[PDB]
Amino acid sequence: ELQCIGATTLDEYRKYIEKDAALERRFQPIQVDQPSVDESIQILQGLRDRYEAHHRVSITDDAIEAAVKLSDRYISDRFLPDKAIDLIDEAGSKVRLRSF
Amino acid sequence: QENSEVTVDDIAMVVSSWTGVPVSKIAQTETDKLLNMENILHSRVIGQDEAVVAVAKAVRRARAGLKDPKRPIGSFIFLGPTGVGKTELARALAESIFGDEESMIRIDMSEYMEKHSTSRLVGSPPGYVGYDEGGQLTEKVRRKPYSVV
Amino acid sequence: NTPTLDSLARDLTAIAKEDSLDPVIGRSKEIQRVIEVLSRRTKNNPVLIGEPGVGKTAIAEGLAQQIINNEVPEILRDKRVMTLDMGTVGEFEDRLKKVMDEIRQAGNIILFIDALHTLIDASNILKPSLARGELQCIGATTLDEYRKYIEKDAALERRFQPIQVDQPSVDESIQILQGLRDRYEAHHRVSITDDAIEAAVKLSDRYISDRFLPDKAIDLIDEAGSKVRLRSFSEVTVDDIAMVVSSWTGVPVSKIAQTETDKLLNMENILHSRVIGQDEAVVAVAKAVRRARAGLKDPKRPIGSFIFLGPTGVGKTELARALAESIFGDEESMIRIDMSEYMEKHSTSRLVGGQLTEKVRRKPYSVVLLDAIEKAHPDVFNILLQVLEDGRLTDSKGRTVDFRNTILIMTSNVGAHKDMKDKVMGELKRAFRPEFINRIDEIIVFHSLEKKHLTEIVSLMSDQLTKRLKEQDLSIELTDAAKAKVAEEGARPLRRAIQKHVEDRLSEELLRGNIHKGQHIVLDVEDGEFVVKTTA
Amino acid sequence: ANTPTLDSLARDLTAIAKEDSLDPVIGRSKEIQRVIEVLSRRTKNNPV
Ligand SMILES: Nc1ncnc2c1ncn2[C@@H]1O[C@H](COP(=O)(O)OP(=O)(O)OP(=O)(O)O)[C@@H](O)[C@H]1O
Numbered sequence: 001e002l003q004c005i006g007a008t009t010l011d012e013y014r015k016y017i018e019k020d021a022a023l024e025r026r027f028q029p030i031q032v033d034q035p036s037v038d039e040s041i042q043i044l045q046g047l048r049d050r051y052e053a054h055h056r057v058s059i060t061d062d063a064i065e066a067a068v069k070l071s072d073r074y075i076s077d078r079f080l081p082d083k084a085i086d087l088i089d090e091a092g093s094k095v096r097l098r099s100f
Numbered sequence: 101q102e103n104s105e106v107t108v109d110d111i112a113m114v115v116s117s118w119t120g121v122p123v124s125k126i127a128q129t130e131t132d133k134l135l136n137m138e139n140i141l142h143s144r145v146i147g148q149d150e151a152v153v154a155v156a157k158a159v160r161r162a163r164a165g166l167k168d169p170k171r172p173i174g175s176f177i178f179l180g181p182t183g184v185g186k187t188e189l190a191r192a193l194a195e196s197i198f199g200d201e202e203s204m205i206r207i208d209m210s211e212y213m214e215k216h217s218t219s220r221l222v223g224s225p226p227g228y229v230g231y232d233e234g235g236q237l238t239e240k241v242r243r244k245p246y247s248v249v
Numbered sequence: 250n251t252p253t254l255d256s257l258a259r260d261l262t263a264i265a266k267e268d269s270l271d272p273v274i275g276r277s278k279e280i281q282r283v284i285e286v287l288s289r290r291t292k293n294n295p296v297l298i299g300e301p302g303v304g305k306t307a308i309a310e311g312l313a314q315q316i317i318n319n320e321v322p323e324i325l326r327d328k329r330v331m332t333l334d335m336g337t338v339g340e341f342e343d344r345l346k347k348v349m350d351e352i353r354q355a356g357n358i359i360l361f362i363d364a365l366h367t368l369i370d371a372s373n374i375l376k377p378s379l380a381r382g383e384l385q386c387i388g389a390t391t392l393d394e395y396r397k398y399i400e401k402d403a404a405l406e407r408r409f410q411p412i413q414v415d416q417p418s419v420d421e422s423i424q425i426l427q428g429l430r431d432r433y434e435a436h437h438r439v440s441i442t443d444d445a446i447e448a449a450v451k452l453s454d455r456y457i458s459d460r461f462l463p464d465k466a467i468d469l470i471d472e473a474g475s476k477v478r479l480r481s482f483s484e485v486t487v488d489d490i491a492m493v494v495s496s497w498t499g500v501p502v503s504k505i506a507q508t509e510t511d512k513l514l515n516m517e518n519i520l521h522s523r524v525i526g527q528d529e530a531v532v533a534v535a536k537a538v539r540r541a542r543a544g545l546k547d548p549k550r551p552i553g554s555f556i557f558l559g560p561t562g563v564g565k566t567e568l569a570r571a572l573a574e575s576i577f578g579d580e581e582s583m584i585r586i587d588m589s590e591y592m593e594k595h596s597t598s599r600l601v602g603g604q605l606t607e608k609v610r611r612k613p614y615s616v617v618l619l620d621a622i623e624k625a626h627p628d629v630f631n632i633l634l635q636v637l638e639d640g641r642l643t644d645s646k647g648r649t650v651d652f653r654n655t656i657l658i659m660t661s662n663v664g665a666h667k668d669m670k671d672k673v674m675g676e677l678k679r680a681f682r683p684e685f686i687n688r689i690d691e692i693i694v695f696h697s698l699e700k701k702h703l704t705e706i707v708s709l710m711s712d713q714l715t716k717r718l719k720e721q722d723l724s725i726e727l728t729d730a731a732k733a734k735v736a737e738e739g740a741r742p743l744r745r746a747i748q749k750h751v752e753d754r755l756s757e758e759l760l761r762g763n764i765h766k767g768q769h770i771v772l773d774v775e776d777g778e779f780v781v782k783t784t785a
Numbered sequence: 786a787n788t789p790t791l792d793s794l795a796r797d798l799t800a801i802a803k804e805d806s807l808d809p810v811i812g813r814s815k816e817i818q819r820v821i822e823v824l825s826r827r828t829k830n831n832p833v
């Protein structure tokens with residue numbers, strides 16, 4: 001009767017929902033995989049628009065490619081594209097501060 | 101009309117989406133691939149012609165609708181000298197099967213030398229510390245059932 | 250002061266006034282034991298240990314009955330047996346302390362407690378009131394929960410007392426029911442024939458195994474006495490009981506019915522034609538089980554030992570499974586214990602345990618197979634030897650597990666004709682003690698492993714490959730010329746070659762289009778070589 | 786009889802099956818008949 005959309009991490013799933021075994025049955029799982037490098041680049045551009053508008057700087061395309069690939073390589077403790085946009089916003093704040 | 105034809109293909113699609121395993125009617129860009137998979141491997145891994153033959157054979161039979169058993173797709177023991185490909189072949193295979201070869205389940209069994217480390221393949225018994233995050237291997241297969249352990 | 254504690258729970262003598270409860274059948278010795286312990290002054294208040302549904306509370310009820318009568322001696326005379334309603338009683342402590350005041354008022358209130366472990370909340374004033382005294386009560390728990398209790402031995406072992414209460418005999422249960430069949434037949438306005446009662450007991454002790462006597466049989470009687478009633482809107486019989494058991498467990502009523510003394514005829518046919526080869530072997534074992542099971546012999550032991558000898562990997566496990574299906578069915582009666590894992594003299598620890606003990610605990614109606622027994626050790630060997638003596642193993646709790654209708658079949662390779670007929674005993678008496686041999690039921694030995702029989706197996710295997718396709722979809726047929734081409738193969742695992750020649754080749758050729766679904770795929774040797782065609 | 790004090794609070798299956806909303810159950814005649822029997826019993830009346 002009521003349409004729902006749930007969202008848990010794998011960890012909470014195994015630990016909590018899987019434990020229930022009845023409510024789990026009610027819902028329908030859908031795996032969302034981390035984007036590859038290229039998909040991450042496109043996501044990063046779409047968001048680059050807003051991040052530019054908020055920091056008031058302009059983020060190069062190759063800047064974003066480097067953010068994606070670097071953060072794929074030298075962070076390896078959290079996932080994309082959260083990593084990449086975190087770097088992008090870091091850099092934006094850093095540059096705006098560098099304006100002062 | 102024609103659209104009122106929920107057929108085997110559509111159940112196959114909702115399965116292969118639900119569980120990661122690819123049960124459906126394979127098409128071009130796949131059959132050509134599965135046939136040429138021997139050549140893909142023998143590109144990535146040089147020499148060692150015999151192995152890639154048997155691995156490609158098993159992947160094909162499994163993917164061709166054969167492999168009636170409820171037992172796993174394949175089971176190989178690669179022996180030989182060092183620096184020959186016993187790991188490179190598996191990396192090539194997981195890469196050609198999926199891409200990036202990073203979906204491959206890699207378990208360095210050289211780490212489970214102890215008697216009790218056998219815990220972290222199956223988890224830690226209920227109640228005991230680490231019970232929730234259990235299954236260094238099992239959770240990896242329940243995450244992605246169609247992979248190369 | 251009756252008001253408060255009667256508001257706590259109803260008295261048993263109140264029921265015994267008109268004796269609403271059925272008079273319990275037998276248990277007179279056990280009730281006498283209860284009277285003994287209640288007569289004592291140090292450890293007077295007992296606790297009845299037994300499985301659920303065995304009728305432990307029935308013993309307390311019959312006790313209240315013998316209390317109303319004069320069977321009870323004088324010191325225990327004038328004693329009201331009550332119980333406890335935890336529901337009907339911030340304030341529950343006040344009411345319970347009031348109950349304790351009334352216990353102090355009249356020292357003639359033998360209380361009763363079911364599920365005593367989960368009760369001692371109330372312990373806060375019960376366990377103290379036990380120490381002071383005059384709370385003489387009775388306890389009804391299980392065994393393991395009694396262990397959980399005695400783990401409070403500090404203040405509770407001194408006072409309590411164990412009274413093991415166990416299943417009535419499969420015979421005794423008949424008189425139990427015959428005594429109490431009256432009440433239900435009155436309730437449902439039917440009548441219960443005594444053959445129906447004995448049949449219900451004989452199907453309860455065998456085909457359900459989940460619960461215990463007499464609970465099993467009483468439940469069956471009541472389910473029949475309601476089914477027949479609803480069928481009318483008269484007399485219940487074996488037919489209804491077989492039907493309700495079939496509804497319970499899910500086995501077919503026919504298999505419940507006919508297989509008592511005629512399945513033994515079909516068994517030898519099944520053995521003779523379920524595995525290929527081992528001709529004299531099926532003759533041997535078939536003769537054997539007819540000697541034991543059909544025969545009036547070996548009442549204490551199980552069906553008996555069958556040490557399978559010869560080359561491992563020729564049909565031993567398959568003969569075992571075929572026999573399992575034969576005598577008991579389901580292909581699930583066979584339990585396997587890989588004695589190669591027991592290559593350690595401590596491994597018996599996991600027996601004393603997630604091993605054969607739990608397996609026979611779950612179903613005492615089954616087959617058991619021990620493979621690579623040679624890999625065992627003299628300690629686990631002595632274990633299985635005293636088992637084969639009586640089946641009674643006792644692991645992790647002293648559980649006197651019974652081996653009633655189990656099969657003990659050991660498998661190994663000491664061989665590895667008449668010269669072999671001698672060497673087998675040679676390496677038996679030379680590899681372990683002769684007494685274990687002397688606990689023989691029969692010894693099954695097959696030496697030859699290669700014959701035309703082998704080719705037949707391959708045919709069977711080909712059939713299996715066709716089966717799974719008729720399952721999903723295909724129409725494979727292996728022409729016997731191709732079957733012989735494959736079979737012309739040394740080593741036994743020819744299915745691998747089947748896979749190679751047929752399954753692979755066909756999959757490669759099907760992937761590229763030379764085959765499509767819904768086609769009669771004949772594989773044949775036309776020139777001395779595999780040829781595929783489709784007929785649809 | 787005819788008490789609106791509970792249907793106000795519970796959900797009546799049968800009154801729903803009046804207007805035929807519940808999806809039909811196929812098979813399970815054995816289990817339904819067993820619920821019926823147990824429902825007509827004195828030792829253990831309540832089914833679970
Ligand atoms: N036949 C081959 N073709 C191409 N590269 C190879 C081959 N054999 C080994 N290599 C190279 O060896 C490296 C990895 O070899 P691999 O790890 O498979 O050897 P290995 O047998 O796993 O070694 P180890 O004995 O330490 O397990 C890669 O650089 C790979 O290019």
Ligand SMILES: Nc1ncnc2c1ncn2[C@@H]1O[C@H](COP(=O)(O)OP(=O)(O)O)[C@@H](O)[C@H]1O
Nearest residue numbers: 272273274276300301302303304305306307425
């Ligand atoms: N010896 C017996 N004579 C008559 N009835 C018995 C006997 N043993 C068990 N019963 C029956 O068992 C039923 C209840 O068993 P109960 O004592 O409640 O099981 P548990 O001991 O697990 O609580 C009663 O209907 C009782 O008549």
